[PDB]
Design a protein around this nucleic acid. Structure first.
Lengths: 218, 150, 51
RNA sequence: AGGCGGCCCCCUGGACGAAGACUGACGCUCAGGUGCGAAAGCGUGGGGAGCAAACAGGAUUAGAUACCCUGGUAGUCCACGCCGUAAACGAUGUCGACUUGGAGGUUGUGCCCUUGAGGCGUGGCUUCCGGAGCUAACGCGUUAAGUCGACCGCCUGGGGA
RNA sequence: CUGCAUGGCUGUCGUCAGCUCGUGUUGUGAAAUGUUGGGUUAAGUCCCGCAACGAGCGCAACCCUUAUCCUUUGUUGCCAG
RNA sequence: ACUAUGGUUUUUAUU
């Protein structure tokens, strides 16, 4: 009823035996998650994230797949947060002092494409500028204004974006994630039971904590 | 109270197209004379610039320990590859002893007497970073009170 | 079912696709575990039809 | 271990598991001791199709003592015997025990609310990746090169040996 | 006399597309990754993809040279009524 | 197809 619309269940050889404290029993040989404690567990973690928002601490969201990028790239434009659009550059946070060179270039292309002269020669002066912009926004198009390291990281695809944990947990940063019956949590600190499938309820959940970050008055 | 120690510095040789090229390399430690030390290695053109690249590595991370009587809280073991280091605490203000590849790492952290020994292979970078692994092996206080002593 | 014709015959009919050397016996043996591990990407069967 | 295949029959060695039965530490390893060749060879006696060292004939070539090619002995085969030979190299002496996952196959043994054209436990075998940890490095990786007890051999430059 | 005291000057591949840094990572380190891999190009030029991102030297362009037309310059040169 | 051979010694580490 959380929708969570994949919850039925399916696949007897899907779950991870490590997930027992998140399990609601078995049903037709499938181990099933608890969807009635989701908000009680989220509220328990909200108090820890809200301690960062109430100090305007730098919060990084992951929305690295296109249907979730469209739920953070402009939907959070009143929340003053930062996001990952697609790439992690193999070390975007463990080498940020060098990534800075292409952040400066991204801003150099923003200031060129917002200049009044940008209407002149819509191919012969524009194309070579907009080409590098379409690259650099796919890397840095949500982190350009972050100016340093995260205080916390929030993810809704930790089943594949493992590099997020490999960077965050090497730097000491606490990760907030959603978990499914097959999850294997170690480098993540805050975990809430649900599903990581579809887009609607995971982007609506990301939009519900985006309000917690907006209540930090930025 | 920043202090730095050079342990070793030498030249290196390398193959290139039809010949060789020479460059400089250093082994250093940096500490605060009261609780911490960091370790560095570095290669460069010009010898002072190679040493400086190693000092910047020694500032990239430091290990911070609770020294007791200018010596060790308890005995410790450190390992890196073939280089094994062991240290017994020292008594009566004496007992120093131990070569530069152990001693220099400790005389920069505030240690005055220590009965350190190295075993296996004696590559000094491995011995120094095994002494650092032995400093990751030391524990803090004298607080938990789980043993009668002593 | 490549050749299948008995008795009268004309022209070449030696060069065929599927079975004997690729798709899916002989050749490519240096790939080894590529014959098992990729499962549904390289193996259709599964039972219910032609074993 | 070396290895061993073809078809049929008789005889016949060793492995592996579950719930019980039986002795009641009867066990493990082992200097010496007793045993076992893929091949080539030799020894006593046979046998010669196929192939072929050696040697001949002809070519190629500086020459061709090699490849090509017309022949061909020993050997291969057998009743066997002797030897202990090797990359006998899948480089892992023999026993005991703890630990982390996956993809796959086989063989026991026990189960299944078997709507499966099958599924799941739990032993033995067992291929290939892969986490810890060990090694200089490859990698080993629960069938360990991790961890740690029992027994018997071996090692401490090469030329010379 | 000394190109086995030294400078200054000097072959050629080829005008080939490569040589070389900082930071991060990876390794016990020399180092490697990067600059490799896929295409397009004259080209490390661009595109594709991206544990690498950027950069200096070379590439490009500059400079230079030729055709068309307009404008400019004309004696001891030129010429349409 | 064929087409062999080339002695010993001879470089860069700055204070």
């Amino acid at each position: 009823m959380l929708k969570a619309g994949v919850h039925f269940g399916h696949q007897t050889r899907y779950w991870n035996p490590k997930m027992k404290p998140f399990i609601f029993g078995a049903r037709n040989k499938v181990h099933i998650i608890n969807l009635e404690k989701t908000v009680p567990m989220f509220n328990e973690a909200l108090a820890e994230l809200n301690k960062i928002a109430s100090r305007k601490g730098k919060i990084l969201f992951v929305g690295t797949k296109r249907a979730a990028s469209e739920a953070v790239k402009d939907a959070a434009l009143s929340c003053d947060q930062f996001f990952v659009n697609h790439r992690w550059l193999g070390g975007m946070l463990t080498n940020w002092k060098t990534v800075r060179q292409s952040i400066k270039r991204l801003k150099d292309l923003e200031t060129q494409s917002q200049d009044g002269t940008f209407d002149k020669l819509t191919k012969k002066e524009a194309l070579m500028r907009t080409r590098e912009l379409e690259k650099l926004e796919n890397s840095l198009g949500g982190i350009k204004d972050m100016g340093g390291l995260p205080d916390a990281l929030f993810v809704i695809d930790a089943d594949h974006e493992h590099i997020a944990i490999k960077e965050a947990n090497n730097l000491g940063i606490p990760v907030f994630a959603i978990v499914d019956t097959n999850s294997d949590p170690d480098g993540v600190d805050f975990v809430i039971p649900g599903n990581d499938d579809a887009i609607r309820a995971v982007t609506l959940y990301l939009g519900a904590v985006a309000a917690t970050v907006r209540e930090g008055r930025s | 109270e920043l202090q730095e120690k050079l342990i070793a510095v030498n030249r290196v040789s390398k193959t290139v197209k039809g010949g060789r090229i020479f460059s400089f390399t250093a082994l250093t430690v940096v500490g605060d004379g009261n609780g911490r030390v960091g370790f560095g290695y570095g290669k460069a053109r010009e010898v002072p610039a190679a040493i400086q690249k190693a000092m910047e590595k020694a500032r990239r991370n430091m290990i911070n320990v609770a020294l007791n009587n200018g010596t060790l809280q308890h005995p410790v073991k450190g390992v890196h590859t073939g280089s094994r280091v062991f240290m017994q605490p020292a008594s009566e203000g004496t007992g120093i002893i131990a070569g530069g590849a152990m001693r220099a790492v400790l005389e920069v952290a505030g240690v005055h007497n220590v009965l350190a020994k190295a075993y296996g292979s004696t590559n000094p970078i491995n011995v120094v970073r095994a002494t650092i692994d032995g400093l990751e092996n030391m524990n803090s206080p004298e607080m938990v009170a789980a043993k009668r002593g002593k | 079912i490549k050749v299948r014709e008995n008795e009268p015959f004309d022209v070449a009919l030696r060069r065929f696709k599927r079975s004997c050397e690729k798709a899916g016996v002989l050749a490519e043996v240096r790939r080894r575990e590529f014959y098992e591990k990729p499962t549904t990407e390289r193996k259709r069967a599964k039972a219910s039809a032609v074993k």
